[PDB]
Design a protein around this ligand. Structure first.
Ligand SMILES: COc1cc(Br)ccc1CO
Length: 129
């Protein structure tokens, strides 16, 4: 895309050790699947394109970008060692939205709806085994 957007977060690196866990499987099959199909998922399904959205300060403010397009890739092409890394990615995505935008803005209400669903699913994250 545009040279004025940063490269996306890393999704492939052979030097990072990888592992499947039952918790990572649940994050893909239950958590990502549930959030991806939510009515309010679409702004979160790919990196923020600050050029297209005319947000020239976005990547001045947000230095830890994350989105569910990247998380989907990290899950589908097993990037992670543990579920905590993937849960942190989700939490980063939500916090980016809450830091950049005014409380009560549409995009914040959308993120908050996804986060409510996310928390319900993470409360049932299975015991690792
Ligand atoms: C996911 O972040 C988005 C998405 C849309 Br659409 C509009 C603005 C922002 C910045 O928070």
């Amino acid at each position: 895309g545009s040279h004025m957007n940063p490269p996306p977060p890393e999704t492939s690196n052979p030097n990072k050790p990888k592992r499947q866990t039952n918790q990572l499987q649940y994050l893909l099959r239950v958590v990502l699947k549930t959030l991806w199909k939510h009515q309010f998922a679409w702004p979160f399904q790919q990196p923020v394109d600050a050029v297209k959205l005319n947000l020239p300060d976005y990547y001045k403010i947000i230095k830890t970008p994350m989105d569910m397009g990247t998380i989907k890739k990290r899950l589908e092409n097993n990037y992670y060692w543990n579920a905590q890394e993937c849960i942190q990615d989700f939490n980063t995505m939500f916090t980016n939205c809450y830091i950049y935008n005014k409380p009560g803005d549409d995009i914040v209400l959308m993120a908050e709806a996804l986060e409510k669903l996310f928390l319900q699913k993470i409360n049932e994250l299975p015991t690792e085994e």
